Design a protein around this ligand. Structure first.
Ligand SMILES: OC[C@H]1O[C@](CO)(O[C@H]2O[C@H](CO)[C@@H](O)[C@H](O)[C@H]2O)[C@@H](O)[C@@H]1O
Ligand SMILES: OC[C@H]1O[C@](CO)(O[C@H]2O[C@H](CO)[C@@H](O)[C@H](O)[C@H]2O)[C@@H](O)[C@@H]1O
Ligand SMILES: OC[C@H]1O[C@](CO)(O[C@H]2O[C@H](CO)[C@@H](O)[C@H](O)[C@H]2O)[C@@H](O)[C@@H]1O
Ligand SMILES: OC[C@H]1O[C@](CO)(O[C@H]2O[C@H](CO)[C@@H](O)[C@H](O)[C@H]2O)[C@@H](O)[C@@H]1O
Lengths: 392, 392, 392, 392
């Protein structure tokens, strides 16, 4: 059925495979059997994965205290601390995810009704295409991350650096994957578990934005349904009952958006600050040189992936606001014959409520906020290439 | 007849002469015979002109990779890439320009009616004066661009640089017009075609803003008609029917503005970013020295032309918002005798809809946005003369 | 009588003594005999004074081209160009000042009625106190400007610099008053006329803000009367007629504010940009050293005078907005017994019209705008003490 | 009884012990016996304490003129000048605190009624927990301030600096507590009074924000009561009388907020500017080194205390706005059966009045303002670590 839960659980299950946001019964097709219970496999697997990520974070924390924390070395701190914070706020999200999916399904039942329709791409495929695209570019980003690592490292072995060292898996562990052997012993088994934990951590880092876009698509789907219903009664005389039901469904979607915002404030702030940090870092690294063209394509693919993923996630979140405002223009089309007060309330609502996702009410995710973020990042760069001018 | 299409086709035809925004039948006086069909002369001429501009862009792209892309050398990249992007978004504009002029004419028929009037300058002359002024200052900018080039170059030949080289057309090609002979062979014919393609590209660069101001004038003309109708019933008792028809025409103009904004979002973002780049470059070049006074007058004439054209185009786009808001004050004049709900709706509309052109809803072209742009450019300069402080 | 014209003409006459904003009949107590006619004494005296200021501006223009225009030397350019621009926009203001005072008096007649009252300080004394204070601090600023000049110059004569030069008036002319003898011959008569023209130009520079505050006080007086009338009917049952008349007077004051804004847009932009420039200059000169304590007290008295005069003029202009919004709170006090639609219109008006003075609709003079200006000046300083860091 | 006055007087009395904001009868349980009378003990004790703080300020003023006022030495100027300014604006606050607590109690009597309720933490305990937490972290901040001082100073005595000097109380006075013996004679008695005056001054500095949060909690308590009453009638048919009484209580709370804002504008601006200065200083001191780990923990505990106290005080002030807006969502839940105009007025009010504390209407303390402050501080740091880059 065209439900949000049935559109996420193919990806919620994949996230719980790397133990993201633990819940019991995420594979079930019913959103009421999913619980947060400590007596099963999933909190245990997320706890083991969390201690793995915590040993990673602590080992690199001590390693970069031994080597010195700089703006160039803080990237690992933000990455692993943000993975652990995503784990924590995902546990908190799962504490209400029973209730969150309960209210989501409860308010999305009327959106699978004859008054509404599925235009071209149902929520299933609409979520699946974008989520598989993000997973594809995430696998690509990590793919050419290892590609750059191993080639630059071996095509560096072939020149100096004791050429007799045969490029191998364990050598790649002990050279390109540092901050793990000053605390943990060197071993093939710990090395493959380190690959698994690092791939899982990259999955956390990207699934943060990926999940936020899943939420944004789930809300924008129903808001597009409301706007399409409003457009279907464009040049026709609308009864007061239809306007009342449209207003009630819009109020229910505002309710769901507010509840999701309350449950997701930690995650939205985390992803917004995390994307600000990483995009400002990679734009801080725009006007410099890299070692080989493989590193060039990897870094630029990271740059477009990161900037476009931030832009696409925030544009899908802003699509909630834009889709609520798109029905405003069609409501302004209404003639004097059917005004009936309710349309006035609905127009006032979408004109003054600025219905959109928010961090913690500090900022509302809108196209206006996206442009403000673009300008803020531009100014931050204009001061940062002066910050790091002598280094490059 | 006082139509937008009859006010642009004297300039649409001139733009299609240099093959801008190709359409078939642009010379016709009827806006329904204009089509986007691949089987005629105009898409062929714009394709030849587009490959010409593309060879220009690629040749200078390779030339500036050979010489190094800097902030001073990126100007050519932005210029030719923006000419090609204007070509592309103008093709996309022409994909809907049948429909765009259809809706424009359909909603502008009631604006040529006895309830409305032509105050002093009809849309024909109002468009023609400003468009001929922009074409005049564009011809002037390119005129003293060549003036500065050839004099500085020959009055540079008369001092060193192998004075025996007689100043000639082919020499001006092979010295002042670089980035074309490292890919294309040197020839008088390719040289005159290069002059034609460069003049056409400058025409693209200026006709971007020129067309945006044409659109802004076309919308502001009808909005001024609405405001004049509202002012004509200032101290008189207004019937409900007149207010209803005024509200319906205002809603239709908002419809036309929204449709034009959807069809012109690419072009508006292109011109806004392009003007931001060029104005910030020329203001970046305010506090420096040039070689001869002819270069001084050319550069300062470029500076006033660019800044005043950005200001005038964005002020004409903001004239839509200011003209919609000017009727708000006259609507506030209305006594309690004729309020009739409709005036309340209309006041709420022009108070909260911020009717104006937009990039992609990232920003709405208003006088407030113009002042914000002025402040943003001031701050960008305050960091950029620190960026390029040691260079000057 | 408590009129704006009778409250300004004691200062309009003083401004026309130094030939500011020429009008014929400014001394008359009737605002309809004041005209802009070229056949009398006042346009002749302002023309002579304007050519005097123009010779000053041109002589210093050539002198600072001979010496080099810098940010430190541009102060004279802005000062004299702003005096001449104040002359020009004051001529333009006087072109409508017949009509401006006509509409001002016409809409301020109902404000001298029994429904309104004069609380403590009538418009006469309210204008007179602030205007005499500004004239006093202007005379003080110019007073210690000459004090610093002549002492620092003579107590500089007593050490080196050919001590035999007796400190005299002509010597102060030929040393501390430069940019006048490279074009005009040296003479006691031209020197005393130069003192008169310089004092008049300082009077222009300060009377810009002084006149803007006069306008702001004139509008805020009537807006305070409206707010006091609204507060007088706080806990009483208000008839619909009283609310209608209050709304009509508020609309008439908005009309007068809009007309004055249209007639004063040039002057308001001039004074706002001029104050921005001078305050940013003096704050640019905060963290440096001067020569003697007399120069210290003069410069700091200039600093507090300039900053406090900008703040006070913009706060009086924002007092229009704050006073319109103060009645909003009292209107919110109204019980359900007397709502009568008109109060709803009035509340919507002062909630969404942002009734205030504006430059050219680029910005509305409000306390919010004052705080934004404070932050903008803070950021401009944060980049400017980096601009001029090596100089100090 | 659950009153604001009975929730502050356990802390008002403690503040008057160090002579903060003098009033006569602050220990009484009735808010009408508290007066501002010059004939008793409290204005005398605050005058003695004020001359003590004034001798401190003047002595350090002369000492830092003798040594040179820098951005690093201006901290003492701002600290003691802000303590004296808090004394002055607290005297002004006490000039109306009779009236302020009169209106506060008068409008908070209906909030102790059966229509309202005390959810978990009454205003007594809600104020007490946060106030004791702030007093605890203030005692902690000053505690490790002395801890860092005396250890670093003695564990500095044990290395060079005439080790024979036995670490003592008088030695700590004459070394770590300077700017007091160049004006006052050295004596154990003046030294213990100096400790008392410095602890009292730190209490002023922290009780500024502590009192502002007390006010914010007092207002947010009643606003939470209003929101809880609105939520209690969520799915029930609400009578018009209940909505009218809710609107009247909301208007009365807006009245109390406006009166408190008028009486507290000086203190709110003082605390906001003071927190801006100190937070920007400590963030200016984030990326540097200190001498010993005790200084490290003291400075970082100061940093979290200062940043979190600014954030918590401004978040409690913004809790007024957020709590007024939280009832807006529940009011949007209301069906068409009971709209009754009054709900429309109330929705318009909390949608457009932006009910919150303000400095002097320059800025309204909201979560939006908190995010704007965060961004402004970020930009200020981005220019300040360039200001002090060569120093660190
Ligand atoms: O630096 C620590 C650790 O994580 C890095 C960078 O933080 O890799 C992460 O970033 C890449 C690029 O986005 C991800 O694809 C990858 O999965 C993440 O682990 C890497 O250098 C280190 O292994
Ligand atoms: O630099 C490449 C190419 O275009 C330039 C500058 O980009 O000339 C353009 O700019 C001038 C000034 O606005 C236009 O008038 C001209 O038509 C444009 O082609 C020129 O230097 C180069 O030929
Ligand atoms: O610099 C030219 C000319 O004007 C100055 C500064 O521009 O004096 C003006 O500024 C002072 C200080 O506000 C005014 O009081 C004075 O009246 C103005 O003329 C002076 O240096 C020069 O004479
Ligand atoms: O510097 C003068 C004086 O005050 C200081 C710093 O200004 O101590 C104040 O700051 C600390 C840390 O917040 C407070 O705990 C303390 O109570 C205040 O007095 C101190 O260096 C000087 O004694």
């Amino acid at each position: 059925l065209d439900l949000f839960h049935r559109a996420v659980f193919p990806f919620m299950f994949l996230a719980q495979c790397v133990a993201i946001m633990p819940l019991v019964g995420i594979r079930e097709s019913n959103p009421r059997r999913v619980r947060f219970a400590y007596k099963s496999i999933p909190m245990f697997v997320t706890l083991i994965f969390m201690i793995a990520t915590s040993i990673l974070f602590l080992s690199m924390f001590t390693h970069l205290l031994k080597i010195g924390i700089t703006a160039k070395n803080f990237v690992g701190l933000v990455f692993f601390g943000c993975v652990l914070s995503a784990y924590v706020v995902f546990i908190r999200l799962a504490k209400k995810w029973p209730a969150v999916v309960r209210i989501w399904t409860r308010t999305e039942i009327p959106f699978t009704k004859p008054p509404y329709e599925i235009p071209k791409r149902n929520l299933s495929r609409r979520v699946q295409l974008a989520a598989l695209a993000i997973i594809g570019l995430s696998l690509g980003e990590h793919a050419l991350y290892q590609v750059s690592a191993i080639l630059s490292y071996t095509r560096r072995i072939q020149m100096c650096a004791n050429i007799t060292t045969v490029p191998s898996f364990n050598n790649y562990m002990q050279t390109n994957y540092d901050y793990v052997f000053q605390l943990l012993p060197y071993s093939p088994i710990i090395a493959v578990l380190i690959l698994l934990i690092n791939g899982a951590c990259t999955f956390v880092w990207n699934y943060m934005d990926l999940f936020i876009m899943m939420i944004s698509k789930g809300l924008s789907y129903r808001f597009e349904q409301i706007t399409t219903r409003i457009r279907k009664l464009e040049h026709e005389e609308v009864c007061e009952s239809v306007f009342i039901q449209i207003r009630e469904h819009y109020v229910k979607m505002c309710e769901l958006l507010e509840f999701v915002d309350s449950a997701m404030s930690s995650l939205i702030l985390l992803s917004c600050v995390n994307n600000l940090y990483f995009v400002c870092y990679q734009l801080l690294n725009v006007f410099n040189k890299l070692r080989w063209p493989i590193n060039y394509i990897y870094f630029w693919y990271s740059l477009l992936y990161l900037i476009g993923r931030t832009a696409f996630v925030f544009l899908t979140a802003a699509d909630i606001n834009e889709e609520s405002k798109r029905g405003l223009g069609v409501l302004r089309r209404v003639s004097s014959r059917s005004w009936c007060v309710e349309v006035e309330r609905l127009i006032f609502q979408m004109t003054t409520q600025t219905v959109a996702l928010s961090g913690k009410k500090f900022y509302f995710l809108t196209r206006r906020l996206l442009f403000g973020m673009a300008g803020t990042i531009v100014t931050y760069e204009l001061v940062l290439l002066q910050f790091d001018e002598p280094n490059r």
